Amino acid sequence: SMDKLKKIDQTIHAFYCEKAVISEKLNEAVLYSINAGGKRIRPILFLEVIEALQIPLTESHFKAAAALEMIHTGSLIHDDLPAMDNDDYRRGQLTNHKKFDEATAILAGDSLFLDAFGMLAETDFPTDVTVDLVRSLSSASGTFGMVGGQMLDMAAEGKKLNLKNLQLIHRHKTGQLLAYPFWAAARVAQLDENLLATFLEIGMIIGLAFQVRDDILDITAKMTYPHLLGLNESYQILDESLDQAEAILRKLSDEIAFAPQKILSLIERLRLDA
Amino acid sequence: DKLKKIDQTIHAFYCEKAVISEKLNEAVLYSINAGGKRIRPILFLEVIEALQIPLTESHFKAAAALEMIHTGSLIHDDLPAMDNDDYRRGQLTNHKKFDEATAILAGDSLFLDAFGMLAETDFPTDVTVDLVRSLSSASGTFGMVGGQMLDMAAEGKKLNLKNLQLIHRHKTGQLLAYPFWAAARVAQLDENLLATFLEIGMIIGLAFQVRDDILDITANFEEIGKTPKKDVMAEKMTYPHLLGLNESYQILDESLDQAEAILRKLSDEIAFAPQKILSLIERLRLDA
Numbered sequence: 001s002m003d004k005l006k007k008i009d010q011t012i013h014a015f016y017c018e019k020a021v022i023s024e025k026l027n028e029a030v031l032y033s034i035n036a037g038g039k040r041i042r043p044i045l046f047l048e049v050i051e052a053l054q055i056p057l058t059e060s061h062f063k064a065a066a067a068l069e070m071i072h073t074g075s076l077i078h079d080d081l082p083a084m085d086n087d088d089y090r091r092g093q094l095t096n097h098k099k100f101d102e103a104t105a106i107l108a109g110d111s112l113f114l115d116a117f118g119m120l121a122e123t124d125f126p127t128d129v130t131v132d133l134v135r136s137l138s139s140a141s142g143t144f145g146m147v148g149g150q151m152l153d154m155a156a157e158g159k160k161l162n163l164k165n166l167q168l169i170h171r172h173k174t175g176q177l178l179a180y181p182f183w184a185a186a187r188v189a190q191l192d193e194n195l196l197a198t199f200l201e202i203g204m205i206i207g208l209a210f211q212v213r214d215d216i217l218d219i220t221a222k223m224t225y226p227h228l229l230g231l232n233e234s235y236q237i238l239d240e241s242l243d244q245a246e247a248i249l250r251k252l253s254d255e256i257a258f259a260p261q262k263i264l265s266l267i268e269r270l271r272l273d274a
Numbered sequence: 275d276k277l278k279k280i281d282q283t284i285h286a287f288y289c290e291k292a293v294i295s296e297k298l299n300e301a302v303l304y305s306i307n308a309g310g311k312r313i314r315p316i317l318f319l320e321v322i323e324a325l326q327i328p329l330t331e332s333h334f335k336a337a338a339a340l341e342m343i344h345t346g347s348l349i350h351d352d353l354p355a356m357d358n359d360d361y362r363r364g365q366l367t368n369h370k371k372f373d374e375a376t377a378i379l380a381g382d383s384l385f386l387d388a389f390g391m392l393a394e395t396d397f398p399t400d401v402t403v404d405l406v407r408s409l410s411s412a413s414g415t416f417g418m419v420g421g422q423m424l425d426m427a428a429e430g431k432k433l434n435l436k437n438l439q440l441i442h443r444h445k446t447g448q449l450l451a452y453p454f455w456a457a458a459r460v461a462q463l464d465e466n467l468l469a470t471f472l473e474i475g476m477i478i479g480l481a482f483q484v485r486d487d488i489l490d491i492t493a494n495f496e497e498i499g500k501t502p503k504k505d506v507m508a509e510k511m512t513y514p515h516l517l518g519l520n521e522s523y524q525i526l527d528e529s530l531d532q533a534e535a536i537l538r539k540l541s542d543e544i545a546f547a548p549q550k551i552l553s554l555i556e557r558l559r560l561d562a
């Protein structure tokens with residue numbers, strides 16, 4: 001009903017504006033990175049799986065979605081730093097450290113990480129649900145998730161590596177937090193164990209597809225699919241990953257009260273053509 | 275020994291899961307193992323014990339989470355764009371031992387991992403959610419990171435006592451208040467008791483930064499494990515810079531006195547044995 005993008009941004013603004021401000025500059029810097037566009041694929045997938053499962057959307061679903069986006073946004077800020085990829089622009093816009101300075105951007109990223117779990121604990125979900133969501137969000141973001149993947153992507157700089165090493169980087173650097181929204185929606189829906197596993201499986205496939213798509217675009221728009229396998233095979237892997245994800249979603253819809261059309265449409269907009 | 279077990283708990287979190295990056299685990303564990311007084315996690319645990327609750331592995335995990343955020347804050351605080359120290363805890367800072375990128379990510383890990391650690395306890399789930407909300411509140415934009423920004427923005431500025439307190443209560447106060455509040459929450463105490471423990475923690479937390487400011491300009495490298503007098507070169511707003519050393523020593527001493535008096539008063543209102551906590555506060559006292 002209400003535009004999900006607008007509501008997600010309003011949820012985020014409300015978190016920063018509802019409490020007595022301590023540092024105006026910190027709030028400003030954090031919101032700069034939030035308001036600097038973003039397709040919001042991660043929170044949108046969470047919300048769309050919730051609706052697909054016939055659950056009416058509430059304030060709390062938007063907060064859980066927002067928590068996820070805050071972690072994603074924080075990782076981008078740090079990834080751009082001079083000590084990291086040292087980029088002056090993300091999406092044709094000044095990166096945080098260039099808009100402000102290096103110390104501000106390090107702290108803005110730290111805030112988004114730490115704040116996200118506060119956003120997530122503000123929901124009205126049953127408390128056992130919230131605890132699992134926190135555990136899994138940490139697992140997907142930290143030393144055994146996104147941060148680990150970031151370290152391996154650095155550790156990788158040194159070498160040609162095989163498929164196994166490329167998949168290891170992607171799985172953790174990006175795969176985990178693209179899969180989280182699928183698993184998390186299913187957990188909020190209180191689905192049984194094997195359904196949770198299926199939803200996580202979809203998410204990992206979509207995470208893979210998203211990273212292969214990235215690699216293909218970044219050379220039509222080092223340690224990548226096109227470099228490792230060539231373009232032809234990269235296109236093939238993207239296409240069969242999306243097919244595979246779509247087939248599992250359709251099979252669920254033939255088995256439980258699940259209406260994934262909007263998800264299937266979102267996935268269809270990721271496709272690339274020769 | 276609590277020190278030993280806190281470290282054991284952090285080690286197990288990192289070693290008992292399948293490693294993704296050996297260099298990340300190495301960088302994180304480097305800063306942990308370089309040292310630290312563990313005042314925060316120890317305070318949490320001593321409150322629990324003072325309230326007559328036998329310690330369990332779950333209390334140590336909650337304590338560890340708190341130390342993990344603390345350690346993350348130090349790694350970032352030491353960075354060249356922040357306070358730029360080559361030394362922390364007697365050893366090379368993370369960014370000098372490895373590199374700046376590694377230090378950034380190691381700090382990030384610690385922050386994100388800490389909530390995972392906290393979520394692994396066997397506490398009732400409403401308790402855990404309360405601790406998560408309050409730990410985030412103490413640590414983030416409205417706590418420690420908020421105070422870190424104020425501290426950087428105040429360099430070279432002539433600020434008043436109110437502004438200085440704001441910096442200190444947020445960058446340092448929040449995460450020393452948290453362990454008192456948190457232990458009382460775990461203990462399931464009533465509202466006015468939670469507030470009393472929070473107040474003891476805010477008193478101790480502000481005093482701790484007064485103490486740190488003092489040490490910065492009076493202690494030697496071997497004593498503080500970090501490069502002396504950075505506050506002077508950087509023109510930080512500090513208690514000695516605003517009020518002078520003499521009044522700063524006075525404030526520290528009387529703040530510690532107040533915290534102890536409230537703790538002693540609690541012991542004739544509920545079942546509470548504060549001796550180890552009082553002992554710990556006594557080790558914080560400074561002489562001019």
Ligand SMILES: C=C(C)CCOP(=O)(O)OP(=O)(O)O
Pocket residue numbers: 075076079085146150173174
């Ligand atoms: C976890 C994150 C932030 C992914 C960063 O990966 P890259 O560094 O390869 O991606 P872009 O900067 O091109 O987004």
Ligand SMILES: C=C(C)CCOP(=O)(O)OP(=O)(O)O
Pocket residue numbers: 309310311312313348363445446482483486
């Ligand atoms: C002053 C602050 C808040 C940072 C250092 O805290 P500690 O003095 O507790 O440092 P470690 O013992 O943990 O090294």
Ligand SMILES: C=C(C)CCOP(=O)(O)OP(=O)(O)O
Pocket residue numbers: 347348351357418422445446486490500
């Ligand atoms: C969150 C932190 C680090 C508060 C203490 O600030 P300082 O910068 O004075 O701490 P030290 O580096 O002197 O330990």
Ligand SMILES: [Mg+2]
Pocket residue numbers: 079084085153
């Ligand atoms: Mg990168």
Ligand SMILES: [Mg+2]
Pocket residue numbers: 079080085
């Ligand atoms: Mg990058």
Ligand SMILES: [Mg+2]
Pocket residue numbers: 351357425
């Ligand atoms: Mg500092």
Ligand SMILES: [Mg+2]
Pocket residue numbers: 351352357
């Ligand atoms: Mg410092």
Ligand SMILES: [Mg+2]
Pocket residue numbers: 486487490
């Ligand atoms: Mg200091």
